[PDB]
Amino acid sequence: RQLAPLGFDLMSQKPKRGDRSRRDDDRYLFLEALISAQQKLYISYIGRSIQDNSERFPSVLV
Amino acid sequence: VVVEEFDGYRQIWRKRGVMPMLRALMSARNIAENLLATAGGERRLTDILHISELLQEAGTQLESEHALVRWLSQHILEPDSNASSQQMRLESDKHLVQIVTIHKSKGLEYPLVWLPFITNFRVQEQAFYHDRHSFEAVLDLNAAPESVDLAEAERLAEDLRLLYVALTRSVWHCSLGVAPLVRRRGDKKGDTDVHQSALGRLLQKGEPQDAAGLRTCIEALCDDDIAWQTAQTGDNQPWQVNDVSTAELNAKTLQRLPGDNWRVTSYSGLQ
Amino acid sequence: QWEPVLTEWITAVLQAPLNETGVSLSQLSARNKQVEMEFYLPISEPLIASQLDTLIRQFDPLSAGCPPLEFMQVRGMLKGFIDLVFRHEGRYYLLAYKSNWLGEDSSAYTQQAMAAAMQAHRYDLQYQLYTLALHRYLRHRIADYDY
Amino acid sequence: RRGELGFDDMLSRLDSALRSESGEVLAAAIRTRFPVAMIDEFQDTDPQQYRIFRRIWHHQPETALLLIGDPKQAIYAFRGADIFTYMKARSEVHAHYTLDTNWRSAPGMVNSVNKLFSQTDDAFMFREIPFIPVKSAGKNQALRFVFKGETQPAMKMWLMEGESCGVGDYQSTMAQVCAAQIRDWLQAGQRGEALLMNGDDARPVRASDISVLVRSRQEAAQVRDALTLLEIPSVYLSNRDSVFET
Amino acid sequence: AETLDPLRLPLQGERLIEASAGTGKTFTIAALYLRLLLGLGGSAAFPRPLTVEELLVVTFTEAATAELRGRIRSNIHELRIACLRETTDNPLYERLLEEIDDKAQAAQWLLLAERQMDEAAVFTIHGFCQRMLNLNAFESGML
Amino acid sequence: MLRVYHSNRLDVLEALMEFIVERERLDDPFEPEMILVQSTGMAQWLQMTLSQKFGIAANIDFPLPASFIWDMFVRVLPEIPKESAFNKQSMSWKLMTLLPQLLEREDFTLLRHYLTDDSDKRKLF
Amino acid sequence: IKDPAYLAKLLTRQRRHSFEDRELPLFRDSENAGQLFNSDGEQDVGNPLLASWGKLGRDYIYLLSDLESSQELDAFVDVTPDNLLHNIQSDILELENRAVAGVNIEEFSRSDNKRPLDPLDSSITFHVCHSPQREVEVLHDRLLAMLEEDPTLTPRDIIVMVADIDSYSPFIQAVFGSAPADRYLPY
């Protein structure tokens, strides 16, 4: 998920180390789910549409 | 027996949900196999499955059981089109002839394209045009013929753009349907309205002609890539299916249980 | 309107001692009390009711009546919420509260009526599991522990 | 009053924000956010959208504007698009760039299009929409749709015989002719006669290759009813009908 | 009109590209995106290289924006591979590799572009208008 | 002493916590043991693993980090109010009173064109 | 890293083992630790997934190394790389680059320089589906196949994570409530 900045917040203009961000949190959650898998990892995604059979692209992480 | 099994279906509907009740109804009555064995029932079965998925998605957010039936009756009475409530493709493995409009064929690719009604045109009656100098939209509420002609010119330009879009999607072969179409109510007036269409403006070079003149204009531009033939109405046989026997298949049987009686309980669970 | 009777009933409950030596609830400090302790008890064997009820009836004297309940084999974890655990003079004690008591209005709540209520509501298994959990907790916490 | 918004309301609110005095400085903030713009599909451009783009990126330095589009594809005039906005944009800008190579079709179809659309000057009947002869690709020069006999040409204009005809009879006869051509392509395609050849590679023509391009829903239903009579199933990809009406 | 070269287009002022039907317009947008990311063109180039959050691509259809984002991501990955290998099988990619003198910094910029492609500014018309209204809500006067 | 244990998986960290519990025992038997967790589900999984390792998982509190920080604020520093004056809704209701009072100031010239055009107290809130 | 005067302070700290009592350095090569960090202060991580995914981990390990009175002990159990998932975890843990780019023609022509992947290795599988209902149905069928294949696999050790739990949990409840008595696993 990517969340747009409010537009007048100073934390978005100047980021620090301990700043909350939904993008980096999800990109680290995917890495923690990759590390936490012990035996089997089953990644499933919508690769094809059901309406017009158009090609759907996966995430950048996958 | 029917009332008893429908009361059991109602108990499953109140306890398990919508999709388990519909799945048990399709498994006990075996209606899905009968719809797949019936010619033309696969589209009906896919529509039933899509309606079942939409009813599950709408009943998971509704607490009451009659509220989902009221929602289904309201969505039957409301024919409005959403992104999810449209019809899907029936089957993907079997090859089907794809009918597609000119606006929905922009940016796509097709090997063989057939255009049977590319000569059919529509005459615009409303006077809504654009100025040739200021390039602003001018709506003429009065029935002035100059605004009607200036709107018909933009209509003809839109038809020529539609003709270009419909012609520039073929890869190997495109076929066109040309005919001396007359929009006027007169039967034989000595002139035809193909110059009022988009295709006839390129064949007759924007000049009014007759049917023999249209035929000579078609036969004038004959090359190795452009050819013409007459439209002969005739049918001999529909098709040949060329069926082959289906491959054998059986479903696997689960040998062991997936899990034991594992639950985190309390004193109230043991009483 | 119930409040001035409720506060004097509460102070009459707290003044009454509940011990074999006569220890009241006012002698328990904040470090000595532990209110609503939650425990998860593990069990790896299939819990058979027939092999458990005979072992309960072998030692518990309140199991003279009370025909055995029926429950499936439970393997995994058992949750429990003890009401109060409190220590006094180097000795631990467990305390639970029951407050339904719909069928009694006179002074007939003697030891026989309370024993009949324990046999009817089946709190004996809960009390035995509470003793097992407290025994395991005192064995894990304090080294060189005797029951 | 309700605090709601629409799709055109976003364009109208941005145009009203740029229409004010301070909002031009807001456009400068956009010049602080994105100092470049590459706008695809400029034929489907509302006049409010072009007014916004002209207010933001007309002649300011360090910012680039790249309007990539095609005036021959503006077919969304019923929706709200306008080719006169594209002609105003062409009259305002000075540089013009066109692509020469065509990578999709066979060179026979490209020569057929360049023969049909370059009969006279300004075939699209507007002075600001010029047509140029496009060039085919060298890697797809050997694309041939072959029948059981000779090589089939690119464009085959089926001329319906007669002096004057109506609309419905012409539609029914051309639908029957199209269904006969579809069943002739599919009957000879499953025997290895009609093929698609790329160089030396060959492919049999399946039912998914042939596509009928119609304009409305009624003539699409006419094509589907004339094609299901000859035991040929067909799907409608432009079907926007709801499932709750069946 | 004039012919268009994707590696010789001046990125100054207003330019009007007329891509005909069937031409590689989606390939041309990815080529101009790779040109804007690395800053190529020489005298007709941009005065400074831009990041992924500064390149704005506007396409009306949402599925067209998703397909263009996937194609630009694939072109970024292919140009990163061709810059790490100093060779390619495509002539336009060959001229793109011949236009740059340095290989390590361009590969690092393409790796940063591949990592920041999730935060790319490839929006629709109404999406970009709503983002501009919600971002600078004070100058616009919106809720 | 602050101790950070770097490990790849949580099972080795649970074994280290088991070794710390079995090595150093608490002086008070009823003293709670604070285990900071990410969520309630991780607290339940840690309680399951501690019950499987020790045989009993009791008198162990699983506080959230902000709740543990506020509990340390209560325990270390006395005379602390239960609710903060700088709540989100409290700051919103204070700013709804303070923003029309600051419209005459020169620094609020950007919000004056945003608020004083048309307002049914909707943009202000 | 922040400063070269902070890099030496980081190099002075080592991690001693909690059980074996053996000290280990923070880096693989202490002499090339200054060459690994760039002039701006960002380390060129050899693993691309760890570099592109773990920025929160970078900030957290930086703020943990910024502490003064911190005592760091390491307890790392090495994973034997046999499967594909164990290969990925070993490449992440050992901090090495196994992505063969083929900088020269010898690295590009030959292909046996990579790691061999057995076709029976069902550790990491990618499944393309058409519908979310079909996606959770294929998920349930593959979980039943994994439960039937591995006998020492309890259902409590299986976790399913959905990015959008609002648009999938109706389908999850639908395909998990519609199971027969011989096919029902608890959910």
Side-chain angles (χ1 to χ4, degrees):
Chain A
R1 290 199 53 166
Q2 47 214 18
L3 288 187
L6 195 46
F8 47 88
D9 52 332
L10 300 171
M11 287 181 57
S12 297
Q13 275 73 257
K14 180 178 295 181
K16 290 188 62 181
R17 300 296 181 179
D19 290 352
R20 176 177 58 247
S21 56
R22 188 50 61 184
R23 172 173 170 265
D24 302 1
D25 196 19
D26 293 357
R27 292 189 72 169
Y28 192 52
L29 271 178
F30 190 79
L31 178 61
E32 279 178 330
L34 176 60
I35 290 299
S36 170
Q38 287 185 337
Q39 297 184 1
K40 288 176 179 59
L41 180 66
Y42 175 78
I43 297 180
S44 187
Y45 58 94
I46 306 176
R48 281 298 192 92
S49 181
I50 208 185
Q51 189 72 24
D52 302 328
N53 293 27
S54 301
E55 181 179 1
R56 298 290 302 272
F57 293 94
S59 178
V60 196
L61 318 174
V62 195
Chain B
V1 169
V2 160
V3 167
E4 177 67 33
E5 69 176 0
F6 264 84
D7 194 15
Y9 294 153
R10 187 182 61 176
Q11 289 294 139
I12 293 299
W13 151 267
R14 290 173 67 255
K15 289 180 179 180
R16 307 275 286 272
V18 196
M19 189 66 63
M21 182 213 62
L22 290 166
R23 196 60 54 89
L25 178 58
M26 289 171 61
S27 180
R29 290 287 185 175
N30 204 20
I31 52 181
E33 190 180 14
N34 302 332
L35 284 181
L36 286 180
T38 315
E42 206 275 339
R43 167 83 276 181
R44 156 166 43 181
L45 187 60
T46 53
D47 288 356
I48 282 174
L49 259 62
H50 198 189
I51 285 169
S52 301
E53 289 180 1
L54 290 178
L55 280 178
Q56 177 73 22
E57 285 188 335
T60 36
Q61 298 182 358
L62 289 179
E63 180 180 358
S64 180
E65 289 85 7
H66 193 28
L68 187 55
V69 189
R70 287 169 173 168
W71 178 90
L72 183 60
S73 63
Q74 186 178 178
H75 271 245
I76 283 177
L77 290 179
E78 291 181 359
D80 60 328
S81 61
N82 294 20
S84 181
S85 60
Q86 284 181 357
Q87 296 183 358
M88 314 174 306
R89 191 176 180 177
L90 39 135
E91 53 187 0
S92 179
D93 179 71
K94 306 299 180 180
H95 302 275
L96 307 178
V97 180
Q98 301 177 355
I99 309 174
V100 47
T101 55
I102 321 292
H103 298 76
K104 290 293 297 180
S105 177
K106 185 178 181 180
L108 297 185
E109 179 177 359
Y110 295 100
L112 310 182
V113 179
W114 240 96
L115 298 89
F117 326 116
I118 208 55
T119 338
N120 185 27
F121 62 97
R122 199 103 80 200
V123 182
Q124 185 177 359
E125 296 89 3
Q126 299 184 187
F128 171 72
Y129 66 100
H130 302 274
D131 183 67
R132 262 67 181 178
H133 300 269
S134 62
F135 295 149
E136 299 181 358
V138 178
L139 176 58
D140 191 13
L141 305 179
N142 300 122
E146 297 90 2
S147 301
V148 173
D149 294 329
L150 260 61
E152 208 274 340
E154 303 174 0
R155 158 224 161 271
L156 187 56
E158 185 182 358
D159 293 359
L160 285 161
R161 284 168 274 166
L162 280 164
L163 171 64
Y164 182 80
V165 165
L167 277 180
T168 48
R169 294 312 166 189
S170 57
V171 179
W172 276 278
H173 181 60
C174 55
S175 301
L176 290 175
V178 200
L181 180 59
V182 177
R183 191 57 62 177
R184 204 175 182 268
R185 301 298 181 270
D187 300 359
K188 186 179 181 180
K189 296 300 180 180
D191 58 327
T192 177
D193 300 330
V194 196
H195 65 90
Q196 294 287 337
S197 179
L199 187 63
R201 203 183 190 270
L202 305 181
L203 297 178
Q204 299 178 348
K205 303 178 181 179
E207 300 179 357
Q209 284 178 173
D210 213 329
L214 178 61
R215 187 174 182 178
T216 52
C217 286
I218 285 178
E219 293 177 18
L221 34 117
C222 282
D223 299 322
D224 299 1
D225 307 332
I226 301 178
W228 88 280
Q229 266 188 7
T230 171
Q232 179 181 0
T233 296
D235 173 64
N236 307 329
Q237 50 180 344
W239 207 19
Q240 297 295 325
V241 52
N242 195 20
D243 61 325
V244 71
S245 300
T246 63
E248 183 178 2
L249 43 97
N250 296 271
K252 292 184 297 179
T253 311
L254 201 65
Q255 305 176 1
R256 206 196 173 185
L257 297 180
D260 301 328
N261 188 23
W262 196 284
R263 52 180 59 182
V264 194
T265 179
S266 303
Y267 165 69
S268 180
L270 301 180
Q271 172 66 34
Chain C
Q1 57 180 359
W2 251 277
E3 173 260 321
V5 193
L6 191 61
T7 173
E8 65 95 7
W9 169 80
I10 282 174
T11 57
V13 162
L14 295 186
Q15 278 178 358
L18 15 81
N19 205 32
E20 46 93 14
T21 52
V23 178
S24 302
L25 288 173
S26 60
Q27 304 177 4
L28 309 177
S29 63
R31 284 298 189 92
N32 295 19
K33 294 178 301 181
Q34 189 67 32
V35 192
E36 305 299 318
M37 188 175 64
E38 41 182 358
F39 64 94
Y40 280 67
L41 185 65
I43 164 177
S44 180
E45 297 182 353
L47 191 54
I48 309 180
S50 302
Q51 297 182 358
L52 185 62
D53 186 71
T54 57
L55 189 60
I56 292 308
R57 203 169 299 179
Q58 189 184 359
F59 292 94
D60 176 66
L62 297 178
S63 186
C66 191
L69 24 76
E70 303 176 359
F71 60 96
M72 298 61 180
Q73 302 177 356
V74 178
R75 175 187 176 184
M77 290 191 300
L78 175 72
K79 293 184 60 178
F81 278 80
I82 310 179
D83 298 0
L84 184 54
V85 185
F86 59 96
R87 59 175 180 176
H88 187 78
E89 59 181 0
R91 181 158 295 183
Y92 306 97
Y93 295 94
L94 194 139
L95 170 60
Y97 303 139
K98 301 297 174 177
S99 57
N100 175 79
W101 221 245
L102 52 90
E104 299 293 325
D105 62 327
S106 60
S107 60
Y109 29 63
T110 58
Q111 195 179 1
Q112 301 92 5
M114 289 184 296
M118 287 282 297
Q119 289 179 0
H121 289 176
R122 252 299 179 182
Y123 296 146
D124 178 66
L125 183 60
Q126 184 184 4
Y127 128 88
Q128 282 150 346
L129 289 159
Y130 283 171
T131 53
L132 179 65
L134 190 54
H135 168 80
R136 285 194 173 187
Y137 173 71
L138 292 175
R139 187 179 59 180
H140 171 53
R141 182 60 58 91
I142 295 104
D144 195 70
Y145 162 71
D146 180 69
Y147 181 75
Chain D
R1 191 255 304 176
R2 293 185 176 182
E4 301 174 348
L5 207 69
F7 299 110
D8 304 328
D9 281 16
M10 306 175 181
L11 308 166
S12 74
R13 279 300 186 176
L14 193 58
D15 186 70
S16 301
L18 293 183
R19 210 76 169 185
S20 60
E21 182 180 0
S22 61
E24 169 67 33
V25 192
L26 143 79
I30 305 180
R31 292 190 289 267
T32 331
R33 190 58 183 177
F34 310 114
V36 85
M38 300 189 301
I39 303 173
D40 191 16
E41 302 287 334
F42 204 63
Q43 53 268 5
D44 305 334
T45 300
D46 300 330
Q48 302 178 356
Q49 304 176 2
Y50 182 61
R51 275 154 53 184
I52 286 173
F53 295 148
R54 191 185 179 270
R55 193 148 179 87
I56 298 171
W57 288 296
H58 195 47
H59 288 334
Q60 289 83 5
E62 94 178 0
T63 64
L65 184 67
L66 304 180
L67 311 173
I68 307 178
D70 196 10
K72 304 174 295 300
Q73 292 178 331
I75 62 178
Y76 294 92
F78 69 100
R79 192 182 52 86
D82 177 43
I83 199 53
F84 284 77
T85 54
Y86 189 84
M87 289 189 273
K88 183 192 300 180
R90 188 176 182 270
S91 300
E92 280 187 4
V93 308
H94 301 337
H96 296 327
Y97 300 94
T98 49
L99 290 181
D100 195 14
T101 60
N102 184 24
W103 307 89
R104 184 189 306 271
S105 300
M109 226 289 298
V110 176
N111 289 137
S112 174
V113 167
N114 296 139
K115 181 60 180 179
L116 184 58
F117 279 89
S118 300
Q119 292 284 152
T120 179
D121 177 72
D122 299 358
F124 292 93
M125 83 182 300
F126 283 155
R127 302 304 305 268
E128 288 84 9
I129 310 180
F131 184 77
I132 51 175
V134 295
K135 194 182 299 180
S136 60
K139 64 174 183 178
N140 301 121
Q141 210 180 358
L143 297 183
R144 287 182 301 271
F145 167 65
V146 281
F147 210 65
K148 55 177 181 178
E150 64 172 359
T151 65
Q152 200 73 210
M155 195 171 70
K156 194 173 187 180
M157 298 179 298
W158 290 88
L159 177 58
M160 201 266 296
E161 188 69 31
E163 302 290 330
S164 179
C165 180
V167 176
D169 305 359
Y170 146 79
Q171 279 180 2
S172 300
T173 48
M174 290 318 292
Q176 192 168 359
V177 162
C178 180
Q181 278 301 311
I182 283 178
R183 73 169 178 88
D184 285 1
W185 290 352
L186 289 181
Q187 183 183 335
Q190 60 180 359
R191 301 196 305 264
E193 303 180 2
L195 297 176
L196 302 168
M197 298 184 59
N198 183 24
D200 296 331
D201 302 330
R203 175 190 177 183
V205 268
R206 304 301 180 181
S208 60
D209 301 2
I210 306 111
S211 60
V212 179
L213 259 60
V214 298
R215 199 179 60 180
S216 177
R217 194 182 285 103
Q218 181 181 0
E219 59 183 30
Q222 176 68 218
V223 167
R224 191 172 185 176
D225 291 1
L227 203 56
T228 195
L229 191 133
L230 304 182
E231 215 181 1
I232 299 178
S234 60
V235 81
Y236 191 23
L237 298 181
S238 303
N239 186 25
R240 299 175 289 104
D241 195 12
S242 179
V243 208
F244 295 140
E245 214 181 354
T246 61
Chain E
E2 303 176 0
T3 173
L4 174 64
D5 298 330
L7 277 79
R8 295 302 177 182
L9 175 65
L11 306 179
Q12 289 84 6
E14 300 178 328
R15 312 297 182 179
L16 180 62
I17 292 178
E18 184 179 359
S20 299
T23 65
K25 181 177 61 60
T26 325
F27 172 72
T28 316
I29 295 175
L32 292 182
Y33 205 94
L34 293 175
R35 175 182 174 90
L36 273 169
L37 277 178
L38 302 177
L40 261 56
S43 61
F46 224 75
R48 56 183 186 95
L50 308 183
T51 59
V52 198
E53 59 182 0
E54 297 179 353
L55 304 184
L56 176 65
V57 190
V58 176
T59 317
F60 180 73
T61 316
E62 185 182 359
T65 59
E67 173 257 2
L68 183 47
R69 179 187 291 106
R71 182 153 280 101
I72 285 175
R73 164 69 166 85
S74 181
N75 282 267
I76 282 174
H77 188 52
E78 283 179 359
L79 191 58
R80 177 180 171 269
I81 288 178
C83 193
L84 285 176
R85 294 177 178 174
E86 281 79 22
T87 175
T88 180
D89 297 354
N90 189 270
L92 191 133
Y93 280 78
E94 180 183 358
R95 298 186 294 107
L96 280 173
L97 288 176
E98 284 177 359
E99 275 200 0
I100 327 173
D101 48 352
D102 195 10
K103 304 302 179 180
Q105 187 67 220
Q108 187 67 32
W109 288 353
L110 286 165
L111 179 59
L112 289 181
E114 187 179 0
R115 292 175 184 178
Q116 291 287 145
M117 201 50 202
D118 182 68
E119 217 182 2
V122 186
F123 306 134
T124 54
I125 308 179
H126 306 265
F128 171 71
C129 291
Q130 186 62 37
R131 187 155 285 102
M132 286 300 111
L133 286 183
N134 291 16
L135 194 73
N136 305 6
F138 294 151
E139 291 86 5
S140 60
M142 299 299 300
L143 301 177
Chain F
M1 183 178 300
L2 188 127
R3 293 179 174 268
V4 187
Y5 295 160
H6 290 354
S7 179
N8 182 81
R9 55 187 58 179
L10 207 61
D11 300 329
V12 196
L13 295 169
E14 197 270 344
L16 284 176
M17 184 171 53
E18 172 260 0
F19 182 77
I20 288 300
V21 165
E22 292 287 335
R23 172 189 175 184
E24 300 179 359
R25 293 179 174 89
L26 251 51
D27 303 331
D28 184 66
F30 292 147
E31 176 182 354
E33 194 174 21
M34 304 297 181
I35 294 186
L36 296 197
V37 292
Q38 300 171 338
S39 67
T40 321
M42 191 181 177
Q44 288 166 326
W45 187 88
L46 283 178
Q47 204 164 12
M48 178 191 74
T49 55
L50 286 184
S51 62
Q52 196 175 180
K53 234 297 180 180
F54 293 149
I56 171 66
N59 204 13
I60 297 178
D61 194 12
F62 299 96
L64 296 181
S67 180
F68 179 74
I69 276 299
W70 187 252
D71 195 14
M72 290 297 111
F73 285 173
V74 167
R75 288 176 181 181
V76 168
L77 284 168
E79 297 290 329
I80 304 304
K82 307 303 176 181
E83 45 93 16
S84 180
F86 279 78
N87 287 333
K88 183 188 297 169
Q89 304 94 1
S90 186
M91 281 184 305
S92 74
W93 280 107
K94 286 171 186 179
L95 263 28
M96 195 184 174
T97 323
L98 286 177
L99 279 178
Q101 299 181 359
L102 297 179
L103 289 180
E104 210 70 28
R105 210 169 185 266
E106 195 181 1
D107 297 359
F108 291 91
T109 176
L110 185 59
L111 300 181
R112 185 164 62 252
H113 293 270
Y114 176 76
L115 194 59
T116 61
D117 293 5
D118 47 321
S119 292
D120 55 327
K121 297 181 179 180
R122 187 196 293 107
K123 292 185 176 181
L124 176 61
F125 184 77
Chain G
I1 212 70
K2 172 191 290 300
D3 290 320
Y6 184 77
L7 185 59
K9 183 249 179 180
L10 192 68
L11 279 172
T12 45
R13 302 180 58 180
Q14 292 183 358
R15 299 167 185 168
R16 51 174 301 271
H17 206 276
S18 181
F19 291 152
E20 298 172 340
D21 302 0
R22 39 177 294 184
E23 297 184 1
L24 298 177
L26 306 189
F27 299 95
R28 177 181 178 182
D29 193 10
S30 299
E31 300 179 359
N32 298 330
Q35 302 179 359
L36 284 180
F37 284 96
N38 212 20
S39 61
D40 300 332
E42 41 182 1
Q43 183 177 352
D44 297 330
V45 185
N47 187 272
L49 309 180
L50 186 54
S52 62
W53 294 349
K55 189 182 180 180
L56 181 62
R58 292 250 290 266
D59 301 359
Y60 213 98
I61 199 60
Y62 181 76
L63 290 183
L64 279 181
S65 59
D66 204 11
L67 299 180
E68 303 177 2
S69 60
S70 59
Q71 178 70 28
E72 36 179 359
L73 306 193
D74 54 331
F76 287 95
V77 174
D78 197 9
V79 36
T80 59
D82 46 353
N83 301 332
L84 184 71
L85 176 65
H86 282 355
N87 275 310
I88 291 302
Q89 290 183 1
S90 179
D91 293 337
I92 289 180
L93 179 71
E94 262 63 39
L95 204 67
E96 57 183 359
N97 187 24
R98 290 298 301 180
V100 177
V103 197
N104 44 317
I105 36 94
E106 190 264 353
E107 201 78 18
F108 178 69
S109 300
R110 203 63 64 92
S111 310
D112 43 65
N113 54 325
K114 304 180 180 180
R115 317 178 72 92
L117 174 62
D118 299 330
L120 299 179
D121 194 9
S122 59
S123 61
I124 299 180
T125 49
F126 300 97
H127 287 234
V128 162
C129 303
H130 293 70
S131 179
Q133 163 89 351
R134 184 55 181 175
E135 176 176 0
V136 190
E137 184 176 4
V138 171
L139 157 83
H140 179 267
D141 295 358
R142 283 307 303 258
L143 282 187
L144 196 64
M146 286 169 179
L147 281 171
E148 196 186 10
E149 179 183 359
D150 194 12
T152 61
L153 182 60
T154 57
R156 48 185 171 89
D157 300 359
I158 305 180
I159 180 173
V160 176
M161 298 173 157
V162 177
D164 204 332
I165 207 59
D166 300 331
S167 61
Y168 276 81
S169 173
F171 290 151
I172 295 237
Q173 191 178 356
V175 310
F176 275 79
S178 177
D182 60 329
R183 215 197 309 175
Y184 176 73
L185 57 109
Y187 72 104

